[PDB]
Copies of this chain bind each other. A is one copy, B any other.
């Protein structure tokens, strides 16, 4: 049925506004991560930004047109060091999957918008993993485990694919000569 005048319509636009701002913030944090020498983390911020773009697109497509007024609070800034940005991003994700989306979903169900409610709940699942990545990386930075581990393992250069075996990533990739910043733990998800 029509969304016109419902609370859900307002919530969808509110979510769209938040998703849109999150996309920008994450792209900026991605640039900062690159400056801080964390390439894997930089690419993660960029990918997360692209995924927020997709959450926003799904939400945007439900709307039926016209200008709508919304009242909501948003993070006024800021761009800091990568660890701080990861912590702030995780807090944003946390609010979305623990408070905002579950609430929007419940209201949607109550107003009779089952599909939309399902979408809100589904987006919340995505935000929870987004938070996991951000928290895990923040923890790695705090513990000094981004480029060094206790036991020998495999490290992959994101720039050229070189694989290094050892307790930590090398200062310079022996293949492409790029800095340690480009290394990540070798992952196999297939």
State the A residues within 8 Å of B (CB): 40, 48, 51, 54-55, 57-58, 118-119, 122-123, 125-130, 133, 136-137, 140, 156-157, 159-163, 173-178, 184-190
Contacts and interface: CB of A to CB of B under 8 A. Distances in A.
A55 to B, nearest CB: 6
A163 B125 contact: yes
B190 A189 contact: no
Contact of A125 (B55, B125, B162): B162
A177 B125 contact: no
A53 to B, nearest CB: 9
A160 B175 CA distance: 33
Contact of A189 (B58, B125, B129, B185): B185
A156 B175 contact: no
A176 B126 CA distance: 10
B176 A55 contact: yes
A186 B126 CA distance: 12
Contacts of A128: 163
Nearest to A118: B174
A62 to B, nearest CB: 11
Contacts of A160: 51, 54-55, 58, 123, 126
Nearest to A61: B177
Among A57, A125, A178, A184, the most chain B Cβ lie within 10 Å of the Cβ of: A125
Given A48-B161, A58-B176, 12 more contacts: A54-B159, A57-B176, A58-B160, A118-B174, A122-B175, A123-B175, A126-B161, A126-B162, A126-B163, A128-B163, A130-B161, A133-B190
